[PDB]
């Protein structure tokens, strides 16, 4: 799970892939409910944290409601929230393992967005709030000539009626 993602939904987390009914150490025997998607952290969005979590499976439970159409390239469907999933199977699912890494954007991300996700890649930039200025005054007593520049919008001259 990527924890932080789901461009549209803030409180969400995509599932890169979920193997189910994993019998014992061996993992090739798990039911591939979701195929493996490559990491796709958007450019300029910081460090996305991805985690690998393992649950203790008491009894074989068919996760039909959780199975995903393989191959799934309709990213929208990857929407997922652990709490609901765990609550469903909390009786037979208890976590026992963790492993998480954080990754930035990279050229492979552009490949993922285009080749298989088949959409234009989003670009994000860190934007700060505009600086605070006290309310403009008709007479800026004792203030330097820079005062008028603080409250202007356009850096080019205008001529109005002329």
């Amino acid at each position: 799970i990527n924890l932080d993602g789901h461009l549209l939904e803030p409180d969400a987390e995509y599932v890169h892939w979920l193997l189910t009914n994993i019998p014992s150490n061996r993992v090739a025997e798990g039911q591939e409910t979701c195929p493996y998607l490559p990491p796709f952290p958007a450019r300029g969005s910081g460090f996305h944290r991805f985690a690998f979590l393992l649950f203790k499976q008491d009894k074989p439970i068919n996760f039909s409601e959780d199975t995903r159409p393989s191959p799934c390239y309709q990213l929208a469907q990857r929407t997922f929230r652990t709490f609901d999933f765990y609550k469903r199977h909390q009786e037979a699912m208890t976590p026992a393992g963790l492993a998480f890494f954080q990754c930035r954007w990279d050229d492979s991300v552009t490949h993922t967005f285009h080749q298989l996700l088949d959409m234009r890649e989003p670009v994000f930039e860190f934007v700060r709030p505009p600086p605070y200025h006290p309310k403009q005054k008709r007479f800026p007593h004792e203030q330097p000539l820079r005062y008028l520049d603080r409250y202007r919008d356009s850096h080019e001259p205008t001529y109005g009626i002329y």
């Binding site: 924890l3 461009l7 969005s45 910081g46 996305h48 944290r49 954080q102 994000f124």
Partner: peptide
């Protein structure tokens, strides 16, 4: 495309995000 839908404002929740950015 439903895939293309993107929220205008991102909400990166990673606590160490801004610190790592510096």
């Amino acid at each position: 495309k439903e895939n293309e839908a993107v929220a205008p404002e991102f909400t990166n929740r990673n606590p160490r995000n801004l610190e790592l950015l510096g």
